Amino acid sequence: MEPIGRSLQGVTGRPDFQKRLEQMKEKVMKDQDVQAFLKENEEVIDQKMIEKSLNKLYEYIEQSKNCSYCSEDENCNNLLEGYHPKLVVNGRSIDIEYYECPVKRK
Ligand SMILES: [Zn+2]
Q: How many domains does the chain have?
A: 1
Distance 85 CA to ligand 1 centre (A): 10
User: Is 76 annotated as contributing to ligand binding?
Assistant: no
Across 48-75, b (16+ Cβ under 10 Å) vs e yields ebbeebbebbbebbeebeebbeeeeeee
Distance 79 CA to ligand 1 centre (A): 13
Range of the domain at 4: 1-106
Distance 26 CA to ligand 1 centre (A): 27
Phi first, then psi: give them for residue 24, nearest 5 degrees: -65, -35
Return residues with CB closer than 5 A to ligand 1 (ion).
67, 69-70, 101
Question: Distance between CA 21 and CA 42 in Å, rounded?
Answer: 22
DSSP string spanning 11-28? Answer: -S---HHHHHHHHHHHHH
Distance 62 CA to ligand 1 centre (A): 16
